[PDB]
From a paper:
Nevertheless, reliable HpPgdA homologues can be found in several pathogenic bacteria. In order to escape the recognition by the host receptors, some bacteria have developed a mechanism of chemical modification of peptidoglycan, in particular through N-deacetylation.
The crystal structure, despite the relatively limited resolution, 2.57 Å, appears quite reliable: the electron density for the protein main chain atoms is clearly visible from residue 2 to 291, without gaps and with a good stereochemistry. The polypeptide folds into a single domain, characterized by a non-canonical TIM-barrel fold: nine ß-strands, labeled from 1 to 6 and from 9 to 11, are arranged in a central barrel surrounded by six α-helices (labeled α-2, 4, 5, 6, 9, 11). The more significant difference from the other members of the family is represented by a long arm of about 25 residues, from 161 to 185, which extends away from the molecular core and embraces a nearby enzyme monomer, strengthening the quaternary organization of the protein. Four monomers are present in the asymmetric unit, arranged around a four-fold rotation axis. The putative active site of H. pylori peptidoglycan deacetylase is represented by a heavy ion coordinated to the Nε nitrogen atoms of His 86 and 90 and to the two oxygen atoms of Asp 14. A fourth coordination site is occupied by a water molecule. Since a similar situation has been observed in two other mono-nuclear Zn-dependent deacetylases, polysaccharide deacetylase from B. subtilis (PdaA) and peptidoglycan GlcNac deacetylase from S. pneumoniae (SpPgdA), the ion was assumed to be a Zn. In both cases, the main difference from our structure is represented by the accessibility to the active site: in HpPgdA the presence of helix α1, the longest helix α2 and the fact that the loop connecting helices α7 to α8 protrudes towards the active site opening, makes it poorly accessible.
Numbering used by the authors:
A (entry chain D), B (entry chain B), C (entry chain C), D (entry chain A): 2 to 291
The structure:
Amino acid sequence: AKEILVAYGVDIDAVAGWLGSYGGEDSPDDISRGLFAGEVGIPRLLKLFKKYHLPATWFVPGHSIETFPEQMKMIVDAGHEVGAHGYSHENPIAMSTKQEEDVLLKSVELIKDLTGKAPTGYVAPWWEFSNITNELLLKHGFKYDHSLMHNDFTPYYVRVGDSWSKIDYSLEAKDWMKPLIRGVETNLVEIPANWYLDDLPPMMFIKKSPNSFGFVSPRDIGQMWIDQFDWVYREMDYAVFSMTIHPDVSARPQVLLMHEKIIEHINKHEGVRWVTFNEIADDFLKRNPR
Amino acid sequence: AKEILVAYGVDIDAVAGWLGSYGGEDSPDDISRGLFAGEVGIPRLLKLFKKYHLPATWFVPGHSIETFPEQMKMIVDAGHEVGAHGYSHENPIAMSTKQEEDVLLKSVELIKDLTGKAPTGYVAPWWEFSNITNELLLKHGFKYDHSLMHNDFTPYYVRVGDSWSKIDYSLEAKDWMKPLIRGVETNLVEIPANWYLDDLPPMMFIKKSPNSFGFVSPRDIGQMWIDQFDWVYREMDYAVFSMTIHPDVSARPQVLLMHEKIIEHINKHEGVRWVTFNEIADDFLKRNPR
Amino acid sequence: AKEILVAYGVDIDAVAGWLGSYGGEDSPDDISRGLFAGEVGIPRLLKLFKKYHLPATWFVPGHSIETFPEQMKMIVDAGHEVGAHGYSHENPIAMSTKQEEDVLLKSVELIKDLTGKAPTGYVAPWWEFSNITNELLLKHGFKYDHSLMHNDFTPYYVRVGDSWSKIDYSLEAKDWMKPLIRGVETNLVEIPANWYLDDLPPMMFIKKSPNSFGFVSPRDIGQMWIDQFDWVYREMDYAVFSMTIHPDVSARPQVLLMHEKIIEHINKHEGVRWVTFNEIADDFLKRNPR
Amino acid sequence: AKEILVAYGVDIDAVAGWLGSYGGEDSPDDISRGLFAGEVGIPRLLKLFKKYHLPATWFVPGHSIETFPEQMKMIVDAGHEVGAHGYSHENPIAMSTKQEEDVLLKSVELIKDLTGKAPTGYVAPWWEFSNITNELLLKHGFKYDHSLMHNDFTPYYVRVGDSWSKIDYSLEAKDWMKPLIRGVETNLVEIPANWYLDDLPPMMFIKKSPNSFGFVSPRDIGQMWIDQFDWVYREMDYAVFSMTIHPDVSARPQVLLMHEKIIEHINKHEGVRWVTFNEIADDFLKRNPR
Ligand SMILES: [Zn+2]
Ligand SMILES: [Zn+2]
Ligand SMILES: [Zn+2]
Ligand SMILES: [Zn+2]
């Protein structure tokens, strides 16, 4: 009795990512790559998912929602779940609590008008926080997050109020020689993010980022994702194995192929169940309450 | 009835690239690499193309035209198409509309005196824009561009006048929470650029660029280009598959070899037709007008 | 009669690394990755070591000691050696001699209260010095270091007092055209660090570091470690082959697997003896005194 | 009748490289890696060369000469050629003509006192120029250089006096829209440098360099060097194939192995002749004068 819950979470960065994270603000050429993600990328992923009768979760920035209305329709009509992901993919930590709350508000209503239901799930743009737990909870609806990394392949409840001492070399060592102090567990369930299961850093060329990659090969990345599944399957009876992808990157033919190899491999395993993130949270909320 | 139009577009960066893009301005050693591209690199590619009875398009910067006159003759005499690519490979977006127009003017007359005909095609240096659509059209001749990335393996007509709201954290979220607004379709046909089909970023060492690579292997890159062909061939009946290369990089023995494997692989496929970019634009203009 | 002493040295950077070296100070998301290292990472490595009845040395920052008390207990109870590694993983060279001495003091007493014995070994955070030899010696206990790189696969005694002339282009060449002047041999034994046998640089994504990697594949790294063993085994009769790893990186399923291949390979060789660093120093102190 | 002249040029950066190029000035830990290059690195390469009865050329910085006197003796006694490479590996282009001349003077006399003869060959540290042609010639002895990149696998005579127009966006396009103007051929013969045949950039980790690599695998690099040999052998009857290496990197067991594969491969080819750089210049001076 092995139950491995595997899922694809699709972050639709498209133009919003270049506006909010990736330095493409003033680059007609980058913005053009954003338009590819929405207009050409979204449909290719939907083709991929349908070919394998797969469900999925789309974390769609408001901007992407209002900029690719025809593709948004295509996603809702497939029965896929829609989660929040900012408006212009702004890093939550560079905003005021007001700015960040106005963005969260705006995203909620965008997704409600589009789908009928309010979104249950959230992904922080570029994967930041600050006091997002507070708002995801305050801002109702939000049942789970997929931005944090306290864990690997098991969900968990997010503690709010963790604290730590930064180093200050203008002071004496005892002033900062203190441990991190864990806060208190909340009801926000975390389906963890993982840099090792994210297609974008390794495979998207970002000219303005000193840390850019983009020419790591789909085959080395494909193999690494499989390696992680193999271990997890071997060492766990209950695990959730979620993959973060973007149409910006994963709708490119060479990585489209990569996913076909990943999907076919996973489907050779028994106990595997493809789901959406909301179904992972629901199951976890039942699997162990409090 | 599968028609896959595949083409090699050769950007002759040589010395111009180091002067305009790659930080080699004050580096005798870099400039020396530029002289290799023109004097030794150009002939090696011509040898490659002739061995496989391949046509090709060369996007030659003015500077390269006036600096390698003997090699320019070798290219014209092979019957290859010549497109524009700046003078000293200056990024269009750092120029005034006047500077950029004087460069365009100068390039046009350089290519006309060299070939007899004015150039029909253009590639923006390092792949920028600004209001280049306007000028490529205004500046007559220009029938197509190969700098933008709204699409993959299908050409398209370039809309001018797209607009978007940048993020300003000095303002309130509603001030920038707006979609991108598409402009209006022009007659400039785009045969799209693609970082995943460009030899330079992965394989040229650029000391002054924090984002430099240069030691990614021709074999991982070769494989990635093939992977893209394989998918495109499998999933499309009409597609254009163009590769951007530079004598600076692709005339190096280890990547010369890489292309022989790529070319031999493509030639095993039926429906494949090697062409020049101008022939791709002509066919597209007919394949679907307006 | 071949004696190859091979060891795993585990640097528990966890949260301390993000606080002291890796720029994660103000990143809830990074700090969350630090918590993974301690809470989830430490136990996984212990599982790995136990599966192969391997001993090991853990270089635990004070911060990690006071932040993961339950996991610290799990390590001591396995019989593994505990060495120093700062408090908040602060780079020794950015501290005053007082700051650096207070950190050393504090680490010593932390490790003594936890284990009963004072630590014999030390690893400089991020691998710096300054006048650490002086203090490792002064601060008693410290019998060996694993931060320096004068050598490969043979330990040695650390000279204190080496000097060299820096270049100053405001002066005349003869002012800095002088050799490095070796100081005098101390009793501090060095079991050498090696970037080619460190899991973190190649495989941890560090957003704030221009020099970040993180998407190099475990299989290419695995192969490189093996390659080094193979040569050493082939060319030496007495050598010490130590690997630096972090729960932050090596407790990730894809590199967990990498180690199983490394361990199984090494165990196919005769003359190989798995030990702790303290046992390597003891043996070396006897193997050749002075 | 195929004559392929292949050679190993060893740049002994050791401590000088960290002092002059690689940012290791204030890093005891880096300097320690420099000491490895000289003390442990030099002998390992000599072992490599002797195993295959190979000749070689060592470009030794003055600093390295005066810092590793025992290893210098080992090199001279093997019959290997010694060329110049600065004192503290200072980039020629950051110096005054006086500073650069004093360094050249000092290097000449260092190498003369050590070997008896003055050096015939030179490599610019980190591969710069400025008006080095003038001095290599003026400063007598110097018959050849191995810093420039006008060509691949054929030597050539260095033109002095090349000029080009830099871009200035404060001016009008016509002010810089001019070609490069070739100067006049000198007698300095160039045995060309090549980033694609240099072990250091891909495989040495340099913390202070944003462009650092260091975890590219010896096997991908090994294969790339071989690929270049294979093409050159296939396409040329007379070529010189020289490899630039450093004890800092190539004396590391995993790349030591890489070279054994490279050497064994080259030795399977007929027409191949292992030589020193001086022998390559002598042959070229005769092969075609003027
Ligand atoms: Zn995103
Ligand atoms: Zn170009
Ligand atoms: Zn550490
Ligand atoms: Zn050097």
